[PDB]
A and B are shown apart, each in its own frame.
Chain A
């Protein structure tokens, strides 16, 4: 598939147009490290699959047993989510700043 394929990608020319000395241009074939984005995607969602499965199943069960009206409760949950998230985001900002 990559017999006559050049090394550079679009990002390589974009990098050659920038003063980013910390990034360099690839000079070898990418066959060795092909499909590494899937590896990093797995690593990103690795600790979240089991927790998300349990949490989403629990949330759906708790909604289903009570048959709550989806629009009203989703509006309420969006409001509560914004409330809690902005509180926790302010606290995360403080934790990060003081390093």
Chain B
């Protein structure tokens, strides 16, 4: 009786506080999402060229929240390996496809004739798109994500870049320095974290991945700039229309786990629980 009343009061207080917290989070997330949608609809990509392509602005200043969901443009060559993360888009099961993207190359060998040293590659992870579970076998190794960038019209631009080290020369006399540059545009997004209750848990040994673990993805692919990989990743966004993976557009880029819909559902659940607890307390 009295113990039941005490338990009901405690449960009602806890659930009411939870509902209030989720409602405030819903308001804040809705406001931020409106701001993000307006900024994306503005469509002024930030060109990541020069020094910015070697150490990225969100790595140098360590402000990914200031650069989150942020339109950027960068050029480089994708590496062959692809990474799949289990995800659902538009209510159907599929996989997010990630590829390494080398935005800067550094050569540190001075015995060029004697030694053929591997270059130091600076890369970031690019979310190519989403492919359904049926068509995961249709993703090809070393596929062409974007058509290669056009050759520049300035004859002085056919030398190795000072910072990125890339030579935009289709016919390079230095065969070992021949690179093909493709230019992508996307949105900077931060990496994900484990949430077992959200069914985002990955078994690395079995090969089952449910959340974007940038640290593991960088380690498994033997990439170099592990910290600049862990900081964030670029989700490729095609201009207006989106065969596999299917790239995200301005209206269908992958939604974060924390959403106003999710917080509204939590608020409704907690408010209902608190109301029921108070009704039962009044009855008793």
Direct A–B touching, Cβ under 8 Å: no
Which residues on A are within 8 Å of B, measured CB to CB?
A: none
Which residues on B are within 8 Å of A, measured CB to CB?
A: none
